[PDB]
């Protein structure tokens, strides 16, 4: 995969991706404005990068997000379409860095960077099960 | 509200806070490992800060996350307790900046900064309506 390549991905925001839906178990978020949650915008940014990566993984491999650095600069109600642009900045071993950017058809809603690590799934899964209570 | 003020928030990770649960609409996340998603980790760090700032907000005020910049350095299967620490690093009028970190009892899982803005809830909510389809 080539540094500089861009992938864009569109998502109509449903009613259930507001801050109250991220944590339905939180009383403290229960009365928040009905806007797209930062944690859901982050997942939508990961989703874009994972889709861009998928052609380049060997069977048995996947990836996990290892860092996120983004701003969230305008609020998005349900119904608008959020487009995420993921651009490859670098590949160093199993580490990929992305520039990630999102716009709701009205405003830029956020941007910054995201890093992912390529993992061997069977091995990672067996390791992480050994910390399971 | 006081700079260097610290809040701890403990949360037992349930099975439904994996990558697959953040976006059940996504075929691409369907076979990810069953570990605590970044977007849910972001959410939990935001929840810690909203709890800490609550006793300082005036009636009719709330807040929104305006930036998240964190690493995610180890994985967490359901069942472990994630403890988030939120330490206020600056307040300048409406803008609060927190140093956030989380550990799952076994590993430090993540570290960085979270910014939030105090909003006038009626006035903000009116602004969301003028862009609601």
From Swiss-Prot, chains A, B:
Consequence when changing residue 22 to A: Reduced activity
Highest taxon, organism lineage: Bacteria
EC nos: 3.1.2.29
Disulfide bridge positions per record: none
Keyword terms: Hydrolase
EC class: hydrolase
A molecular function GO annotation: protein homodimerization activity
Keyword Hydrolase found: yes
Binding site for CoA: 65, 72-73
Pfam families for this protein: FlK
Keyword hit for Coiled coil: no
InterPro entries recorded: FlK, FlK-like_dom, HotDog_dom_sf
Catalysed transformations (reactions): fluoroacetyl-CoA + H2O = fluoroacetate + CoA + H(+)
Active site per UniProt: 38, 46, 72
Residues reported to bind substrate: 36-46, 65, 116
Its biological purpose: Hydrolyzes fluoroacetyl-CoA before it can react with citrate synthase, and thus confers fluoroacetate resistance. Cannot use acetyl-CoA as substrate.
Subunit structure: Homodimer.
Protein name per the record: Fluoroacetyl-CoA thioesterase
Source species of the chain: Streptantibioticus cattleyicolor
